[PDB]
Amino acid sequence: GMITSIARQSIILKCLRQKSVLVSNYELYYTAGLAKKCFGIAVDADMEPKQLLEELQKHIDKVSPADEQEKYLIHLLGNYEPDDTHDEQTVELFHMGETEEHIWQVS
């Protein structure tokens, strides 16, 4: 039921507006993917939610963002308490983030 387009658009709008925080694991996995792409942090779709966040948090604060949207990714990843959701859609969202071909462009 449209979880993938919703999560992508939500994260793009948050980074463009520089408002709000992560509110779901669907958003977390997409955001994690973008961090892999933009910052090269060694995360993968198969990591569990807290594991994924721990790996990102070991390095996100040392990253030098290229623009305001990447700077907002650091804000998103430093302020979230994940639930146990790690389904087929969280995995696809991670892959969508890491391979993002239209970064910061809403549909």
Side-chain angles (χ1 to χ4, degrees), residues 1-45 47-61 63-80 82-107:
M2 300 291 282
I3 292 169
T4 63
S5 63
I6 288 170
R8 177 175 180 283
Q9 199 152 9
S10 187
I11 290 300
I12 289 172
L13 289 166
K14 288 172 180 176
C15 296
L16 291 171
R17 298 169 66 201
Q18 304 166 40
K19 301 291 174 57
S20 189
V21 295
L22 295 173
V23 301
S24 72
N25 285 18
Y26 299 122
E27 287 186 335
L28 171 61
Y29 279 77
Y30 175 71
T31 305
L34 291 174
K36 184 181 171 182
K37 175 186 170 65
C38 297
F39 314 142
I41 298 182
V43 282
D44 69 84
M47 290 181 167
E48 302 304 328
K50 298 175 182 178
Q51 176 191 11
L52 180 70
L53 198 56
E54 179 182 332
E55 179 58 31
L56 293 165
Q57 293 179 350
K58 282 181 69 171
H59 311 283
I60 61 190
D61 301 312
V63 169
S64 184
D67 57 44
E68 295 288 352
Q69 289 65 236
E70 292 184 4
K71 183 178 173 180
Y72 211 74
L73 291 175
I74 299 163
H75 175 72
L76 295 175
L77 298 171
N79 299 290
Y80 183 59
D83 62 19
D84 68 358
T85 302
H86 182 223
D87 63 23
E88 183 177 347
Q89 285 68 49
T90 62
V91 168
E92 179 61 11
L93 276 162
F94 183 95
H95 296 302
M96 285 166 60
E98 68 178 346
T99 66
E100 183 61 68
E101 300 182 5
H102 305 278
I103 200 184
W104 316 121
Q105 176 59 64
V106 284
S107 58

